Each structure stands twice: as structure tokens, then as C-alpha cells.
RNA sequence: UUUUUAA
């Protein structure tokens, strides 16, 4: 295609030969690093070979039709890119198990090569037309299993041809901070019906209504991002509200912004300390770019216990992070086993796969994973870890284990075996005077209501 | 059993 950079911004025009996607165009990385006036994003170009070729050589997709900000191009440039890739990656990866055989011992080996019409899986891997698709879609022979079931990395790849490629002028207000700090409160206590709210996160969509309905009496209906770009926003929006933000990419959210054209503003909440987007090949993210047109930081929880608040302060918050909860009870380290969930209890782990023998284990009981539960508020936490290894996800800077700790406004076990390197900070939190005053949190929650709506 | 997430 054609690449021009009109001062100061950079615009792509798509001819009628080139592999476009809606409104992106569909690039080989070396057809970017050729070109010199791609250079602002041939870091990007780069780190999709290196997790590709050598884990063509992947695609580099890119905003075109519009003249765009270099800064936004390359957000643009790197979210709708590394959706590609994923779906890309995905199928490659279903493609060698069907035609190579799976890699033993594997979850490859979960997979079953089966006849579409002997299936009753839903959705269903296709090796003829090398996708994910409906049942009804496929014929013959094709691949199912857990990455098939349902296949996201395909609803996502098809939102592409929705998404937009300019973004969209209009104030950016970010209110950021601590776990527990009041951001979601803001956005229930603001929102009307002419508004929409988004969230990173799907349990905190269920949050966000059912509190409003029950704190303010008013019928709302909060969205996913992904619900959103995935479908679209079809009636006028005053104030969009994006609760969760930092689970997204810059980039998304510049296109959920294009895609919802609120009149008035938007209102980012999140934590970047909390869990962010994953990408599953690992990619080296270059541009997740702040795009605020305010920032606001709170530091101040209300949730937090304060054995909890000493924890994560210390790790993830330079020691900035203070509760105004009283709650100081020991935290229940339990590894012989000695304790039972109490009803009200969320049951938590950070393992996907373990979540399947606690639901039977704790049957009527809430249990999810850390990452799915990540906004969401619990009188206790029961956490169960099946497994003491060097796994990522229960390192010490994990922001899984950081979501985890604060759900609870009060009681938390932690169900694991003897050995597990958390339980000494579990058992003796760093010290220090984590406790603030509701009133030194009122006049920080004012600072930001003043600006908010200011 | 390495984490988001559509209808
Ligand atoms: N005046 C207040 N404003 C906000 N939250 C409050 C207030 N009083 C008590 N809380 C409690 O503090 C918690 C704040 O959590 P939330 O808004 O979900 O935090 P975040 O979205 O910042 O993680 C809620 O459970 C709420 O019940
Ligand atoms: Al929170
Ligand atoms: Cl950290
Ligand atoms: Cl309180
Ligand atoms: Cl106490
Ligand atoms: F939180
Ligand atoms: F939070
Ligand atoms: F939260
Ligand atoms: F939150
Ligand atoms: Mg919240």
C-alpha cells in the first residue's frame, strides 16, 4: 500500500491488490522494515518475526484510510497486529496437531481428530478451510478441543473488520490507583443511561450492574470491551466509562473510543499493577502508550485489609498503598488441611486448569480464577493452590497473586502445601503504617471528583 | 493444568 506522512501525522492507503483487513492493512514484517517511513514501528515488525519464525514470519497489521498521530499509529499498529498473530498462531498450532499428530505429553494431546457431524462440540477446529468454526460450518474431518471450545482467538479476529482505523478526538480522563480505591465506585456512582460502561473484565460487568441497580435504583447495562469491539455500539453515548482499563492494550482502547464516540468524555479506571493483557505468544509490547488527557491517582484504599494492604503496598506499590479498613486478623495459612470455606467465601486460585476439582470440591461456593475475579469485592477469600512450583503465575511480582490478596474486605486463607515461599510474607507482613483516615481518603477522592468533573 | 475474552 501507500504510506505518506503528512506533518505531523503518518497515513496508509490501501490499493486494490493488498491483503486488508476492514480498515487494516495486512503487512509482511519485512515489508515493513523496508520501508522507511514504517520505522516507528519496526520494533513491532521485529518482535513479530522473533516470536514467529522462530518462536512466513507473522503479519504486522496497520491502521490506513485516515491521517493519524505517529504516537496512535503505532498503539493502533500493535493491538490490532497482535490479535492477528494469535489467531494465526492458534490455527497453526490446531493445523499441526491435525496433520502431524499431537506432541506427547502435552495438552496436544486433549485434542481429537473427529467427523463434524459425529461432534456435538459447538464450535469446532476445520483442517480444510484452517479455522475454528461452527459445527454446522465444517465438513469431514476437523479438530476439537479446549482452544476450540469456544474459539476466541476467532470472535476476536473477526471484530478486526469492525474495528476502527482513525482514532477519535475527545478528553481522556484516567483515574488510576490502588486495589480497592473507590475507581469502579466512581464510575456506579456516576453513570446514567445515557452513558455506556465498558470493563477489561466480565465478572465486574455483573458487579458494576447489580450494585447500581441496588445502591442507586437505576437500570444499567455495563458491556466487556471485547463485547463492545466485538459488536459494536449502536445508539449515542454521553460519558464513556471503562472500568478495568489497564487489562487492555492502548491501542484497543483507542478503538473502543472510535468505535462508541461518547460526546462528552471518557473516563479510564484501572491498575496497571493488576492483570494486564496477555499475549499468548509472549510478544515484547512496545506501544502501549498512555493516552490520558488527565491522570488522577488514587492511593488510598477502602477495601483492603490491612495485612493485605502491608503485602501488596510493599511489592507493587512502593510502599504508597494505605487502607482505611480496620481489619487485622491474622491471615490462614492452612497446609494440613485444617480449615473449610465459609459460605460468602470466594474460592480462588490462579490455575485455569484447577478451577474445574474445586467447583466439585466446593460445590454452592463462588470459585474462579484470580484473573477472572479481578474487580470484584468478597467479605472472604478462600484460596487454594494445588501445586508449589516456579510457575509465573505464583512468582512474588505476580499480578495474579496481587489481584487475589485484595479481593477480600476481610478473611483470607491460603490452602497450599508446606514449602510455598508465600507463606512467610502471608504470615509476617511487612510492617510499616499502611492505615490512612476516611477523611485523608475523602479529600484524595475529592481531588479527583473535582477534576472529573471539572 | 500459565492468564483475558463473543452470542
Ligand atoms: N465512600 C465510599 N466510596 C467507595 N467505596 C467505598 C466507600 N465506602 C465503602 N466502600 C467500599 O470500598 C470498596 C471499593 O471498591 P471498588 O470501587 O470496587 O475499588 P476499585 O474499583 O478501586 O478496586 C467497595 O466494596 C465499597 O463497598
Ligand atoms: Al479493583
Ligand atoms: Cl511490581
Ligand atoms: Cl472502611
Ligand atoms: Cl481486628
Ligand atoms: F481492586
Ligand atoms: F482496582
Ligand atoms: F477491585
Ligand atoms: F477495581
Ligand atoms: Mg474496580
Request: a positive charge; aromatic letters at 8%.
Amino acid at each position: 500500500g501507500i504510506i505518506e506522512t503528512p506533518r505531523g501525522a503518518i497515513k496508509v492507503t490501501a490499493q486494490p491488490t493488498d491483503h486488508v483487513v476492514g480498515e487494516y492493512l495486512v503487512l509482511s514484517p519485512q515489508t515493513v522494515l523496508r520501508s522507511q517511513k514504517l520505522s516507528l514501528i519496526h520494533a513491532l515488525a521485529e518482535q513479530v518475526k522473533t516470536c514467529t519464525h522462530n518462536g512466513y514470519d507473522g503479519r504486522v497489521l496497520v491502521p490506513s484510510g485516515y491521517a493519524i498521530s505517529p504516537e496512535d499509529f503505532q498503539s493502533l499498529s500493535e493491538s490490532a497486529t497482535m490479535v492477528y498473530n494469535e489467531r494465526e498462531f492458534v490455527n497453526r498450532k490446531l493445523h499441526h496437531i491435525a496433520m502431524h499428530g499431537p506432541a506427547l505429553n502435552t495438552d496436544e494431546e486433549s485434542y481429537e481428530l473427529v467427523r463434524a457431524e459425529r461432534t456435538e462440540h459447538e464450535y469446532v477446529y476445520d483442517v480444510d478451510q484452517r479455522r475454528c468454526c461452527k459445527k454446522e460450518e465444517a465438513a469431514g474431518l476437523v479438530l476439537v478441543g479446549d482452544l476450540t471450545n469456544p474459539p476466541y482467538h476467532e470472535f476476536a479476529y473477526e471484530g478486526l473488520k469492525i474495528r476502527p482505523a482513525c482514532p477519535y478526538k475527545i478528553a481522556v480522563i484516567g483515574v488510576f490507583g490502588v486495589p480497592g480505591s473507590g475507581k469502579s465506585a466512581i464510575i456506579k456512582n456516576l453513570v446514567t443511561r445515557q452513558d455506556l460502561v465498558t470493563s477489561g473484565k466480565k465478572e465486574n460487568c455483573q458487579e458494576i450492574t447489580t450494585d447500581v441497580m441496588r445502591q442507586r435504583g437505576l437500570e444499567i447495562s455495563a458491556r466487556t470491551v471485547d463485547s463492545l469491539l466485538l459488536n459494536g455500539c449502536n445508539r449515542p453515548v454521553d460519558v464513556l466509562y471503562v472500568d478495568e482499563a489497564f487489562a487492555c492494550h492502548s491501542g484497543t482502547l483507542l478503538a473502543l473510543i472510535a468505535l462508541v464516540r461518547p460526546r462528552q468524555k471518557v473516563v479510564l479506571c484501572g491498575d496497571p499493577k493488576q492483570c494486564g493483557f496477555f499475549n499468548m505468544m509472549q510478544m515484547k509490547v512496545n506501544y502501549n502508550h498512555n493516552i490520558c488527557t488527565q491522570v488522577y491517582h488514587k492511593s488510598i484504599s477502602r477495601r483492603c485489609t490491612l495485612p493485605v494492604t502491608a503485602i501488596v503496598s510493599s511489592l507493587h506499590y512502593e510502599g504508597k498503598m494505605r487502607t482505611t479498613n480496620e481489619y487485622n486478623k491474622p491471615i490462614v495459612v492452612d497446609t494440613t488441611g485444617s480449615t473449610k470455606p465459609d459460605p460468602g467465601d470466594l474460592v480462588l486460585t490462579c490455575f485455569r486448569g484447577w478451577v474445574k476439582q474445586l467447583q466439585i470440591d466446593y460445590r454452592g461456593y463462588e470459585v474462579m480464577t484470580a484473573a477472572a475475579s479481578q474487580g470484584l469485592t468478597r467479605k472472604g477469600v478462600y484460596a487454594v493452590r494445588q501445586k508449589v512450583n516456579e510457575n509465573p503465575l505464583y512468582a512474588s511480582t505476580s499480578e495474579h497473586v496481587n489481584v487475589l490478596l485484595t479481593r477480600t474486605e476481610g478473611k483470607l486463607v491460603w490452602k497450599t502445601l508446606s514449602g510455598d515461599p508465600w507463606i512467610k510474607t502471608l504470615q509476617n507482613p511487612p510492617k510499616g503504617n499502611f492505615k490512612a483516615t476516611i477523611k485523608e481518603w475523602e479529600v484524595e477522592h475529592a481531588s479527583i471528583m473535582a477534576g472529573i468533573c471539572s
